């Protein structure tokens, strides 16, 4: 295919210099510091994983500028090799999404996939910079190990009671649980349309909307439910950034005693 | 014991992913793909179990993998050198239906649907059908971005199924007419537009072949042409 | 992206070579409501053999639950409304095992309830059998469902049956079975140390993301209809070809208008298969997941 629509323009920026192909891959200049961005990530780390003695892929680590030591400051050691490495990401990320636009923009095709994604560099921006920032402190901010994270997590987590309480959260997990299955129903629905019984002809578009009004009585067909989709997703990711930018700074308490502003009067 | 468990898991994984999963999704794409990297550039599958479907309501048959190609004229030449390397059309692209333009060519037959019902009609040749919530862009004088208007607006050729206001048509001051899809456009109250498309022209817009149906080719070349005008209309940028 | 002019003509159906007799459940064009975002219509309906039951059935499950639910609060509003997340239904936990034979108080309601919903689940799985059937499409939903009841079937059947102790199932009440987790975890210490869980996680995300990835594409596919997936997994215009296109590129390799949803009825049924093995395995073959895992 293709061949046609490897097609001259739809640079961002660049002009020209960057319109190419690396392959399967269209270079530009985000590519271009997609990479830059990355590389100077993961040597300033894996000078880390060094410093640190140890390695293992699973253990090598990195932490930030622990507490008071400050927002500002911290030093390619205590702070730094995380301080930099942060905003390799926070940059290479946003670096590719604007290559993503970039694609977009020539490939024809629209608006949304960038928009989408561009959530996701910000639960984590979150996390690492708003819930932090606002704490005059980046130690909420976090490791960046395979496996401490869950331990990072696992303790603010339970540093505020059995977090499953903060209520926000309560919530986005339930988009993230809807939001799942249904894909559980409409990666199983166009399937058994596209792919039927045994000898029946390829059914039809209102073959599948007929199942549904049948087992559930209403019934979102094609266009709908890829909103709808993009809808619990997108939605839940972020009802999460809210959980916590919350957490750490207007409830200061264990979660459990929210719960109470009802049970309160009469 | 549980190693056993998580251990020979990551076999039901490996297991799918290149394996089912990503066969499919070759399926019926580049059933390989040639053009510089030859046979390929490591080691796919030589081609999955190939299948064959059911063409709906009225027959027919498709088998998946497939080596349908395409002599059908790519205006689109090169630019030098290495593959990779963009490739530029030939003239006014627009047309020759290249890059954001580029259409395809599905059948010269419509998505039927349940029945014959061919999906998607306008909203006269329609039974029952108009407008629960919204304004009407009928009468609505279409812009174009060039901000000289191109045309009047003379239906919404309604989607039967998801009863679906698939297409709005058009009509330019050739006493003529021509649908543009419907997530083009901006219905505002007094105004309309498929601002994509600069007025200053929109005759491009191909015709359809019977003024009651859109055919694939019809949607799909129509559909281009449209689109391309992001890309290609000098204005906007 | 989401309707700017709503249309709905007449009121539409389709045969079921099966049992149309069901059809209560009236046309009723929601437009502001279920019309803006999906769809206007609103029914119809097939209230089967089976769809019978579950509904009978997925009520006293309710209604058991929801009635020795009010006996906590003393047959009273303000209270019943009150702790109405607090209240719960526990199993005769007082532990004391498989040993049915119970109170009702104690093991009771919860072995009533609880081991009533078994039913629900179960017909309207075949609910979701049949209704295919008719229609004569393929049993994806029936697959992509007893991951939905492996997690179940577990979670609340299954192991308790594994320490000979109901002891074990999950309890009834809003904030109990919340509660009933965590403490779920400081048993088998603590527990993101879990293989199976971390994927169950691994995957869990996997959607999120993905239906994040292939609804937010079909989106800028609608310019040319990208949305119809059958009319195109038998057709192929620009639609596909570039919802292809644009990954091909940017990550370099593609899908599949249907091995996407092959990526898709997968990607989300691991993140229920999942679980259901990290749970058979969180209470036996691995007392501790530190441990098991400090020992590898
Ligand atoms: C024991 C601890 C507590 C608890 C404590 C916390 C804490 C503490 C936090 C959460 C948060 C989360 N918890 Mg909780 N949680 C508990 C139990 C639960 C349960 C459960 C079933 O019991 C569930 C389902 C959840 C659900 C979740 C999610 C709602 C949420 C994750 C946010 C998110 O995913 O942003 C996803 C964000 C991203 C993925 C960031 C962006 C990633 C990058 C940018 C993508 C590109 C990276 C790179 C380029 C990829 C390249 C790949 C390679 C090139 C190939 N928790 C327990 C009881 N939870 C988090 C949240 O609210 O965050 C907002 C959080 O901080
Ligand atoms: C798998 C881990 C735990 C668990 C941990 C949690 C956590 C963690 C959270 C919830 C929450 C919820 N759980 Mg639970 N939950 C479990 C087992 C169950 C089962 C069951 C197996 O029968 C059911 C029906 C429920 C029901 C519910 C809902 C009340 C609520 C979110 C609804 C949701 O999005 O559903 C999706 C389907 C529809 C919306 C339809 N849970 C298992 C035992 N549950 C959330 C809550 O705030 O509830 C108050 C929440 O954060
Ligand atoms: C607030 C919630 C926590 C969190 C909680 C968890 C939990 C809980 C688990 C993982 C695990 C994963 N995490 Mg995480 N994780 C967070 C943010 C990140 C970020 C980031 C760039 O922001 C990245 C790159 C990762 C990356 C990863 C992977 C290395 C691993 C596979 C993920 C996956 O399939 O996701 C989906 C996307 C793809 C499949 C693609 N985490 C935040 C800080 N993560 C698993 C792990 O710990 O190993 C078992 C795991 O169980
Ligand atoms: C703090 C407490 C513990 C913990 C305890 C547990 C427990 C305990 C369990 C999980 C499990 C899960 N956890 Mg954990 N988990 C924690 C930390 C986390 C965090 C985080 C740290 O970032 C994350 C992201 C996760 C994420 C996850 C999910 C991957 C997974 C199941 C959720 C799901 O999608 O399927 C949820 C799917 C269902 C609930 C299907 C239910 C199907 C039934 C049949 C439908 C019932 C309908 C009913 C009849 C009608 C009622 C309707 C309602 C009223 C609306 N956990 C901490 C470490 N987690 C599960 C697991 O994988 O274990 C192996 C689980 O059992
Ligand atoms: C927010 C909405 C949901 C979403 C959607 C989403 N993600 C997307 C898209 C969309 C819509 C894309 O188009 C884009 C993509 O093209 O994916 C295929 C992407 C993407 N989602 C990603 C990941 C990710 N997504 C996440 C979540 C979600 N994605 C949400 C649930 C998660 C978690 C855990 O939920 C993970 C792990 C990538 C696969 C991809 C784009 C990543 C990218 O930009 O990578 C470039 C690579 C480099 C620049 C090298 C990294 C250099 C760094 C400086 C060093 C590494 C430090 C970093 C901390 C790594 C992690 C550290 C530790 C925490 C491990
Ligand atoms: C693949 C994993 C995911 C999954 C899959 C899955 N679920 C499915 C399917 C599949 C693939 C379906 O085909 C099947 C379906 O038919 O429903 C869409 C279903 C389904 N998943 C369900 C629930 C469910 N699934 C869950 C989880 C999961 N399901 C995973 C996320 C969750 C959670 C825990 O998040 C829930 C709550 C049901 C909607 C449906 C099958 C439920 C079933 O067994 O029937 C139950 C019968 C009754 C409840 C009888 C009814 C009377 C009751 C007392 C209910 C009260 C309702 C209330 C009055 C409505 C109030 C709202 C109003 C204001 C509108
Ligand atoms: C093209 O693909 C696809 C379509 O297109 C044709 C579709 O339509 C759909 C349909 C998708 C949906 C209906 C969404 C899936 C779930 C949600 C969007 C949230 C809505 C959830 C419900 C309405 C709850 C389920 C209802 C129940 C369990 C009713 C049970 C009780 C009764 C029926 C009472 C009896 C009444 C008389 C999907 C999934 C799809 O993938
Ligand atoms: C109908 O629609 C749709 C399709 O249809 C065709 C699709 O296929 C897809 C695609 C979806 C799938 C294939 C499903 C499976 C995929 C997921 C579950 C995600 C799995 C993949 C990842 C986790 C990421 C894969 C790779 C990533 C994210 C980065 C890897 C990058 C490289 C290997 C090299 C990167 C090179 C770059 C960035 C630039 C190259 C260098 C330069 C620009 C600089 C050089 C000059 C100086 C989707 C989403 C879709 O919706
Ligand atoms: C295996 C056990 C799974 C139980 C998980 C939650 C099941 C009940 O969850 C909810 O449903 C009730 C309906 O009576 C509600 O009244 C309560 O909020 C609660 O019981
Ligand atoms: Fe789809």
């Known amino acids: ?116 994604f ?45 977090f499953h309480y903060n209520p926000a959260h309560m919530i986005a997990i339930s988009f993230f649980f809807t939001n799942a299955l249904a894909l559980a129903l409409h990666g199983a629905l166009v399937l058994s349309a596209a ?25 979102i067909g094609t266009l709908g439910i890829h909103r709808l989709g993009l809808l619990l997703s997108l939605s839940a990711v972020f009802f999460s950034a809210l959980c916590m930018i919350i957490t750490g700074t207007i409830w200061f308490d264990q979660w459990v005693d929210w719960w109470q502003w009802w049970v309160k009067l009469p | 014991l549980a190693s056993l468990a998580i251990y020979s898991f990551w076999i039901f994984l490996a297991g799918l992913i290149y394996y089912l999963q990503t066969e499919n999704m070759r399926e019926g794409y580049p059933l390989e793909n040639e053009d510089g990297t030859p046979a390929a550039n490591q080691g796919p599958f030589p081609l999955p179990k190939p299948k064959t479907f059911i063409l709906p309501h009225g027959r027919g048959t498709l088998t998946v993998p497939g080596p349908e190609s395409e002599d059908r004229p790519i205006a689109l030449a090169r630019t030098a050198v290495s593959e990779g390397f963009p490739h530029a059309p030939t003239g006014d692209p627009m047309k020759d239906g290249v890059g954001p ?21 306008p909203m006269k040749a329609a039974a029952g059908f108009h407008v629960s919530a919204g304004k009407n862009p009928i009468g609505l004088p279409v812009r174009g971005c060039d901000l000289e208007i191109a045309g009047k607006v003379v239906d919404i050729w309604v989607d039967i199924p998801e009863q679906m206001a698939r297409f709005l048509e058009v009509e330019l001051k050739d006493g003529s007419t021509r649908l543009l899809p419907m997530q083009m456009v901006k219905v505002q109250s007094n105004r309309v537009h498929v601002n994509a498309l600069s007025s200053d022209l929109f005759a491009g817009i191909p015709t359809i072949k019977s003024p009651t149906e859109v055919t694939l080719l019809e949607e799909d070349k129509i559909c281009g042409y449209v689109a391309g005008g992001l890309m290609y209309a000098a204005p906007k940028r | ?254 899908a599949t208008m249907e091995g996407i949803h092959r990526w898709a009825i997968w990607m989300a049924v691991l993140v229920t298969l999942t679980g259901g093995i990290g749970i058979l395995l969180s209470g036996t073959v691995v007392d501790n997941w530190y441990v098991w895992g400090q020992n590898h």
């Open chain 2, 101 to 121: 333009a580029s259409w395809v060519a599905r059948r010269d037959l419509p998505e039927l649907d349940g029945h014959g019902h061919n999906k998607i009609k």
């Open chain 3, 1 to 254: 992206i989401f309707s700017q002019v709503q249309v709905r003509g007449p009121a539409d159906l389709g045969m079921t070579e099966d049992v149309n007799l069901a059809n209560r459940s009236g046309v009723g064009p929601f437009s502001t409501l279920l019309g803006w975002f999906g769809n206007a219509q609103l029914g119809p309906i097939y209230l089967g053999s089976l769809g019978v039951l579950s509904l009978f059935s997925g009520l006293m499950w309710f209604f058991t639950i929801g009635i020795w639910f009010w006996y906590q609060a003393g047959w009273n509003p303000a209270v019943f409304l009150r702790d109405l997340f607090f209240f719960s239904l526990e199993p005769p936990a007082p532990e004391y095992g498989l040993s049915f034979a119970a109170p009702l108080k104690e093991g009771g309601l919860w072995l009533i309830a609880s081991f009533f919903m078994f039913v629900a689940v179960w017909s309207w799985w075949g609910r979701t059998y049949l209704r295919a059937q008719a229609l004569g499409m393929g049993k994806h939903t029936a697959w992509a469902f007893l991951s939905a009841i492996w997690l179940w079937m577990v979670l609340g059947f299954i192991r308790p049956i594994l320490m000979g102790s109901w002891s074990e199932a999950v309890p009834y009440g809003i904030f109990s079975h919340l509660d009933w987790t965590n403490n779920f975890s400081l048993v088998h210490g603590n527990l993101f140390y879990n293989p199976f869980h971390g994927l169950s996680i691994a995957f869990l995300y996997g959607s999120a993301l993905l239906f994040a990835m292939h609804g937010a594409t079909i989106l800028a596919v609608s310019r040319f209809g990208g949305e119809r997936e059958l009319e195109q997994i038998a057709d192929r215009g620009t639609a596909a070809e570039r919802a292809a296109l644009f990954w091909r590129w940017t990550m370099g390799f593609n």
């Open chain 1, 195 to 219: 792919n039927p019984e045994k000898g029946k002809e390829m059914r039809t578009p209102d073959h599948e909307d007929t199942f549904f009004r049948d087992l559930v009585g209403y019934s």
């Open chain 1, 118 to 162: 561009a959530f996701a560099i910000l639960a984590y921006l979150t996390l690492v910079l708003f819930r932090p920032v606002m704490m005059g402190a980046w130690g909420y901010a976090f490791p960046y190990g395979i496996w401490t994270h869950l331990d990072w997590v696992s303790n603010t987590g339970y540093t505020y009671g059995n």
């Open chain 1, 1 to 116: 295919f293709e061949r046609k629509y490897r097609v001259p323009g739809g640079t961002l920026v660049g002009g020209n210099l960057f319109d190419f192909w690396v392959g399967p891959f269209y270079v530009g200049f985000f590519g271009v510091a997609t990479f830059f961005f990355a590389a100077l990530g993961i040597i300033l780390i894996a000078w880390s994983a060094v410093l640190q003695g140890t390695w293992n892929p699973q253990l090598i680590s990195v932490y930030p500028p622990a507490l008071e030591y400050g927002l500002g400051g911290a030093p390619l050691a205590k702070g730094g090799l995380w301080q930099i490495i942060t905003i390799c990401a926070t940059g290479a990320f946003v670096s590719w999404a604007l290559r993503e636009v970039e694609i977009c923009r020539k490939l024809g095709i629209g608006y949304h996939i960038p928009f989408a």
